[PDB]
Design an enzyme around this catalytic site. Structure first.
Site, PDB file in Angstrom:
ATOM      1  N   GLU A   1      17.567  26.046  46.731  1.00 19.02           N
ATOM      2  CA  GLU A   1      17.002  27.111  47.546  1.00 19.02           C
ATOM      3  C   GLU A   1      16.146  26.475  48.631  1.00 19.02           C
ATOM      4  O   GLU A   1      16.022  27.009  49.729  1.00 19.02           O
ATOM      5  CB  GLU A   1      16.126  28.029  46.686  1.00 19.02           C
ATOM      6  CG  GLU A   1      15.653  29.306  47.389  1.00 19.02           C
ATOM      7  CD  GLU A   1      14.429  29.935  46.725  1.00 19.02           C
ATOM      8  OE1 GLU A   1      13.335  29.346  46.824  1.00 19.02           O
ATOM      9  OE2 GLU A   1      14.552  31.011  46.101  1.00 19.02           O
ATOM     10  N   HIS A   2      15.562  25.325  48.312  1.00 13.71           N
ATOM     11  CA  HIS A   2      14.714  24.621  49.255  1.00 13.71           C
ATOM     12  C   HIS A   2      15.461  23.900  50.351  1.00 13.71           C
ATOM     13  O   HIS A   2      14.996  23.839  51.489  1.00 13.71           O
ATOM     14  CB  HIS A   2      13.826  23.626  48.526  1.00 13.71           C
ATOM     15  CG  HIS A   2      12.489  24.183  48.169  1.00 13.71           C
ATOM     16  ND1 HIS A   2      11.367  23.394  48.024  1.00 13.71           N
ATOM     17  CD2 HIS A   2      12.081  25.460  47.981  1.00 13.71           C
ATOM     18  CE1 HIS A   2      10.324  24.163  47.769  1.00 13.71           C
ATOM     19  NE2 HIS A   2      10.730  25.421  47.738  1.00 13.71           N
TER      20      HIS A   2
ATOM     21  N   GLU B   1       4.187  23.257  45.698  1.00 12.31           N
ATOM     22  CA  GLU B   1       4.410  24.667  45.422  1.00 12.31           C
ATOM     23  C   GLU B   1       4.119  24.955  43.955  1.00 12.31           C
ATOM     24  O   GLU B   1       3.790  26.080  43.586  1.00 12.31           O
ATOM     25  CB  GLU B   1       5.845  25.062  45.754  1.00 12.31           C
ATOM     26  CG  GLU B   1       6.284  24.655  47.143  1.00 12.31           C
ATOM     27  CD  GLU B   1       7.397  25.537  47.666  1.00 12.31           C
ATOM     28  OE1 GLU B   1       8.250  25.931  46.846  1.00 12.31           O
ATOM     29  OE2 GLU B   1       7.425  25.831  48.886  1.00 12.31           O
TER      30      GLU B   1
END
Lengths: 147, 442, 59, 147
Positions: B58-59, B135
């Protein structure tokens, strides 16, 4: 409290002081009641404020999901206390100040601005655009703004 | 007028591509729009050694593609005013874009490119490693979540569902160009995807563009086979993370859910509607209708609380979560478990009528815009199979009554061993046993 | 499936639960005594007056 | 608390902000620890501060009521501590700012100043006198300063 959750975002911390150190009146005032005046506001102050500013000419009964005819019948036969332009807002004067809140944070929010344009103004779109040209807000999750 | 406005809502078009993938959309008279690929992938579909791929991916889903690297990709999208966003949860990843209905097609291309021909430049990974790693340390301070995760991790413990969607700290540290590939490889496949769109777009025009970039055909029959997941065992237990230096405390209590399919999920929601939610800023305060709310004010029980009905393919978590001072935890919990009980015992027709009118507004609410519509569609299909209309939902709701609720809550709540997540200065919550008993009589 | 069936009609509500104990106990008593008395007497065959009574009874 | 009794006199309220809106460093700092740093000071910080600033060359053992001979013997074999001018104070730069604390008081303290002289300077005595010429402090209980 309301003002405690809010100021949880320094984002709103500089924005309050900005307007302060930018003006001297009206717009120079805070959006969240200063501490000292907490609990010192009166019932009369409320009223007078309302009787003075919530007046027809300054009011608009907008609204989606409905037929204009209805939203109309309501507004007229129902709305009173209005009829007027009430008090006039003290013309906003510019100061050009600089406020600093030293508070030992890993981060340092800071905003520097100048008298931009006003609503309706022609010279508006310019900034709105100069804004985008400079870059305001992202469109790529976790990315960079090459634009 | 309501009863009617529900029908005029344009039916959603669905046509599957002879290669496994599917396409759906709701055309409106709007200039702007939204489209995205809703992949039925997740952290659940992961494993011990890879835990975290779907996120690491997703990154790197935006740091370019083979066809057009970082600079150009980003440049290409920003420059047209589009918004490329996306997420990735335990059982659903999704990458979608917001733009003018004009770019409708050209967009798809982009989406299509990302999923399939994702760059994965190894030079960008070692860069995205330190990122995720942050994160975490930042997400590691959002108790509301730290909780839910811990909740899952015990609610399911020893099952895929007991895993963070961000993955371990180790995995993030050692995942490889390899595994990252593998995930996309094995996971981002046509049948397990839904191209969704809503705005000023005609199914036709859309469907085609898809047929153009989503051309990858399947030979065998295995590439047509939707892998069925090994179910997760629910476990009535608790996990208590104590830190008296934490300002407030969080508590999450839940029971095993029924899973997307099951209709009762609706009822269960109508229920949650009755216990609702609250934060110190609600204005109704002591006059609010949710008994738990009111009390929470009449006694300063908490800071916030919420009823949730998380639904997964084959399971789910039903419960509530509140935040509160170290010394009101108990009273609060007490009252909460209480309300829960009342649900199974003396719920009235007034409580339901209200809950229904609330739910209705809440559902309608989820469909406020284009982004929120495709989300629903990306989901509805992927999860439910078809796509449920507000007209359908609504009716499914108008059918619920007090009697009905008491029965469903009784079914999933009464005398059941629950899962508990306590985090912070929780010296007052104590004893599962007690907490257990609060599961009956009231 | 008795344990199931039990947990459903009996041990579920705290009401039917209690209601069971009551009735249940009733049966237990009524039949625990019998067994106990019977056992006891057996261990004392012919020593109790219940036995040697026939030797002096007859109007 | 110590800072609570103090600030009971607005007199010290503007004086803190004055130096702030007058400078950018050293002298621009507050005499009473800002709130945020309350309780966040360390044992180290103290030490280091002392080991760095309380050094012979910056220290003077004055004292009345005693014979110089004694006050001497003490200083010697007792105040053995190292010398060196320790750390140097960041040269005081001038800002020329303006800080305002709106707080709804019957009174309005306000001080407006400009960079003056220094200790052991030229004009030093000029202001000290210009001061008196302007009037600073009274000598007539409950009177007026005609002077």
């Amino acid at each position: 409290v309301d003002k405690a959750v809010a100021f949880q975002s320094p984002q709103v911390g500089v924005l309050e002081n900005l307007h302060a150190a930018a003006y001297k009146t009206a717009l120079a005032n805070p959006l969240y009641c200063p501490d000292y005046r907490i609990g010192k506001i009166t019932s009369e102050q409320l009223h007078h404020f309302v009787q003075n500013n919530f007046t027809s000419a300054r009011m608009a009964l907008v609204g989606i999901g409905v037929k204009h005819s209805d939203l109309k019948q309501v507004a007229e036969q129902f709305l009173n206390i209005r009829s007027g332009a009430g008090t006039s807002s003290a013309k906003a004067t510019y100061w050009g100040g600089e406020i600093r809140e030293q508070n030992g944070h890993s981060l340092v929010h800071a905003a520097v601005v100048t008298e931009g344009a006003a609503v309706g103004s022609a010279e508006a779109n310019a900034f709105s655009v100069l804004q985008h040209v400079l870059g305001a807000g992202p469109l790529i999750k976790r990315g960079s703004s090459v634009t | 007028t309501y009863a009617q406005t529900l029908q005029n809502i344009p039916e959603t078009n669905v046509t599957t591509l002879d290669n496994g993938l599917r396409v759906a959309s709701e055309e409106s008279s709007q200039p702007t729009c939204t489209v995205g690929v809703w992949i039925g992938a997740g952290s659940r579909y992961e494993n011990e050694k890879n835990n975290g791929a779907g996120y690491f991916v997703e990154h790197l889903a935006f740091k370019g593609t083979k066809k057009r690297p970082c600079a150009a990709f980003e440049k290409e999208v920003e420059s047209m005013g589009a918004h490329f966003n996306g997420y990735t949860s335990r059982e659903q990843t999704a990458f979608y874009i917001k733009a003018l209905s004009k770019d409708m097609p050209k967009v798809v291309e982009l989406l299509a490119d990302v999923v399939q021909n994702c760059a994965l430049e190894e030079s960008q990974i070692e860069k995205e490693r330190g990122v995720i790693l942050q994160e975490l340390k930042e997400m590691d301070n959002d108790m509301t979540n730290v909780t839910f995760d811990y909740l899952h991790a015990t609610a399911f413990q020893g099952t895929a569902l007991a895993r963070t969607v961000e993955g371990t700290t180790e995995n993030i540290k050692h995942l490889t160009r390899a595994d990252l590939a593998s995930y996309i490889d094995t996971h981002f496949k046509a049948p397990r995807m839904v191209l969704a769109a809503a705005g000023g777009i005609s199914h036709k025009e859309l469907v085609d563009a898809a047929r153009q970039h989503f051309s990858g055909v399947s030979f065998t029959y295995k590439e047509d086979a939707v892998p069925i997941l090994p179910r997760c065992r629910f476990t009535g237990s608790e996990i208590r993370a104590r830190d008296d230096a934490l300002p407030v405390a969080h508590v999450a209590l839940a029971v095993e859910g029924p899973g997307w399919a099951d209709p009762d999920n609706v009822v269960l929601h109508v229920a949650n509607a009755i216990i609702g939610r609250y934060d110190r800023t609600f204005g109704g305060g002591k006059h609010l209708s949710s008994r738990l709310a009111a009390l929470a004010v009449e006694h300063k029980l908490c800071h916030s609380f919420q009823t949730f009905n998380t639904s997964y393919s084959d399971t789910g978590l039903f419960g509530f979560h509140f935040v509160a001072d170290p010394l009101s935890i108990d009273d609060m919990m007490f009252c909460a478990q209480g309300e829960w009980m009342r649900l199974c015992t003396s719920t009235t027709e007034s409580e339901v009528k209200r809950a229904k009118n609330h739910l209705r507004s809440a559902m309608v609410a989820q469909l406020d815009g284009t982004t929120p519509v495709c989300e629903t569609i990306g989901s509805h299909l992927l999860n439910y199979g078809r796509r449920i209309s507000l007209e359908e939902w609504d009716s499914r709701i108008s059918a619920v009554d007090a009697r009905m609720v008491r029965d469903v809550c009784s079914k999933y709540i009464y005398d059941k061993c629950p899962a508990l997540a306590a985090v912070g200065p929780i010296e007052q919550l104590l004893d599962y046993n007690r907490i257990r008993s609060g599961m009956y009589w009231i | 499936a008795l344990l199931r069936q039990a947990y459903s009609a009996l041990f579920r509500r705290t009401s039917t639960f209690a209601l069971t104990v009551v009735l249940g106990a009733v049966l237990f008593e009524r039949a625990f005594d019998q067994g106990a008395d019977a056992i006891f007497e057996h261990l004392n065959e012919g020593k109790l007056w219940k036995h040697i009574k026939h030797k002096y009874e007859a109007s």
